[PDB]
Amino acid sequence: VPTLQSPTLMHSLGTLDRMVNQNMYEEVAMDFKYWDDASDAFRPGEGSLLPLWRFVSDKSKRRQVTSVCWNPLYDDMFAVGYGSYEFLKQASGLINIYSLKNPSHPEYTFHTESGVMCVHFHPEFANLLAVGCYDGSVLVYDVRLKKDEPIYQASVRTGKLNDPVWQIYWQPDDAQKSLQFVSISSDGAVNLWTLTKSELIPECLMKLRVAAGGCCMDFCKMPGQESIYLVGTEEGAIHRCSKAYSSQYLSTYVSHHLAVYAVHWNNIHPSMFLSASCRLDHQAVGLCHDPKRAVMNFDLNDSIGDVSWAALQPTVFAAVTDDGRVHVFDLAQNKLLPLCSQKVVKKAKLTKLVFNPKHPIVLVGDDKGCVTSLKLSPNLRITSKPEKGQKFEDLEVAKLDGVVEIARKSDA
Amino acid sequence: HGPIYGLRRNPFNSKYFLSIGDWTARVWVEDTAVKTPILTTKYHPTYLTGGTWSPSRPGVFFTIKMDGAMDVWDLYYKHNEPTLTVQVSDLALTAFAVQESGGTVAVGTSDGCTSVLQLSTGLSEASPAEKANINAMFERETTREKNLEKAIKEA
């Protein structure tokens, strides 16, 4: 009943602040949606990311972007998981949540007390955000409550991975009495978590045996089925199993010598994943059979932060290395050379690349606690348009398969 | 085992009876082929003495022990360890009762008094069939093990 503390005052003030901040970046946003690079219908063989919004907060500069994730419904949310990767500069972690509606001030925020080495939003409900931490504590945060604190934790009583939790995921549990989580850790291996009464309980999935359980630092699951996923290691190899111990390492795609840093499936042609390591080469390899060779190889000058197939097309993909250059390949215009290699940051080593499902932009993330958002010039995004007698998934299977057979019989 | 102290049919859907009497807290069934438990639960410490079910929620139970507890054993969610261990007294509990609407319990202790508890919205339910189900399926495995001894000896 004092008007100057009424909640609806704060509501309309927040909307008026967005209404202000829009009118401070009008060009950056109008280009985000209504602009096509007019000088790439003239030179067919290359492209040019155009840099857009930049997102910094003053608690971030002492921190390093250590994950990024996008929300299923709205397509203006991020989830930056600021944290640490150096062995000697170990800090407390952070997690903002940003928006495209205001880029300057984050909508939400939290403040953990170890390095947030992953995030993931839930796909169906659209708010609950699972995270992990440098010290095994997987956490779950609920967002619309506006209480700067978790709603569940882990302990050493329920379950604790005991070393960094590099990646976590959300499983769809269909209208059941639960929600599901799959994880991965340096010591020991994959664990399943549930969301019970007021707790999160481990169930162990498999152990990554080779000295000790071999370390591992990433995994991805195939969308189109669920059980079969791809797991990195630090012994070097890449493994693939299913949600069982059903032939521990169903596939053992072994080709590497160091810590692999990224794997990725590609949403079209469900047999073909690429991967990427810290041996300065990323390899785009086929999986139904084919476990002893790589269809291709793309060497480069500094080790890979990460890789990502495009959401909109299974030829183009992009990769991010430890120099300042994001470089992005079309696998069907050039053949072993990057279509567009551009340096975006000045004095930081980039470390995280994430695409966007609907609008065509990309997020890349620094070493200095910042995230910067690039746009893809039209030569990078070329989806073969469907027609009357054919389906869109089929043409994009066909392009990749043609490139695969060409370089398969041309390699040897 | 030994001097039995528990007996109660289950309510709210069916006829499966209980046996919380000695320091194992079973759940038994009434058929001429199943003369053996269905959901045997934990071998405990502190020799058991008495409890029942819920008449407003399917198949929880509530032991008491000679050092005293209301173990709110929810029994479709865990199956080994007491979901909620509360010690009302140090002295040994020797009774039990349930409010007819469910949500108030009573035990008088080893000397004297009588303590009346109150259990929150954990006591209500949304689906009463699958708990008849998992207390139906889980003893055809026992009749299945009755077949095996004939099969073993005939082999």
Binding site: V156, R157, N162, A211, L280 | -
Partner: protein, 212 residues
């Protein structure tokens, strides 16, 4: 070089097969160029080399050196006569420098295991799983880590649980536990402090339900 192998495999004419031996010198120019570039990385980054992620500082520098050596060495198996002499000399100085790291840093690690073994109690017993891969170990290898991250995980919990029950106070109670917190015998003290906090986790909730 893969292209040259394919062109060898395409066709047969004995003059051409006496001409596809020639182009290995044109190949050999660029390997020298790569042997130039890696050489620059060696001298520009001798003391403070960038590393892989979450890598410890002593023998997570060995891996960087090893990467440069094994980047330059694996094409040498395939590209094997005057220019070849100067290039094999330049390679054979880069080789000795890229063993100069991977022996002097290993020595510095020997004397640091003497230092730190008595936060950083990790690295002197966390390195020896990086070190166990290629090089040789030292005294009292990490046979003692099946306890020590039990010893830190239980013991940042129960001490942590001695804040929440002291968030429900508002005293001979706390007496009995400050006499237990303070004191190969870190087993029984964790016994004692777990049975210690079960007792007062009971007592404080009793007092709250009989006071509210």
């Amino acid at each position: 070089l893969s292209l040259l192998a394919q062109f060898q495999a395409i066709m047969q004419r004995e003059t051409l097969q006496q001409d596809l031996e020639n182009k290995y010198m044109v190949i050999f120019q660029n390997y020298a160029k790569d042997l130039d570039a890696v050489q620059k990385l060696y001298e520009k980054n001798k003391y403070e080399p960038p590393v892989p992620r979450n890598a410890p500082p002593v023998a997570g520098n060995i891996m960087w050196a090893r990467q440069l050596l094994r980047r330059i060495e694996a094409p040498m198996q395939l590209a094997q006569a005057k220019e070849s002499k100067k290039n094999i000399k330049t390679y054979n100085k880069v080789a000795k420098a890229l063993i100069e790291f991977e022996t002097l840093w290993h020595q510095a690690w020997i004397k640091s295991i003497e230092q730190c073994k008595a936060q950083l109690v990790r690295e002197a017993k966390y390195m020896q799983r990086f070190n166990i891969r290629c090089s040789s170990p030292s005294q009292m290898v990490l046979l003692q880590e099946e306890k020590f991250k039990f010893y830190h995980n239980q013991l940042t919990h129960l001490v942590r649980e001695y804040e929440h029950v002291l968030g429900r106070g508002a005293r001979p109670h706390l007496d009995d536990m400050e006499r237990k917190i303070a004191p190969l015998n870190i087993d029984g003290y964790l016994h004692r402090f777990k049975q210690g906090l079960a007792r007062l986790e009971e007592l404080v909730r009793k007092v709250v339900d009989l006071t509210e």
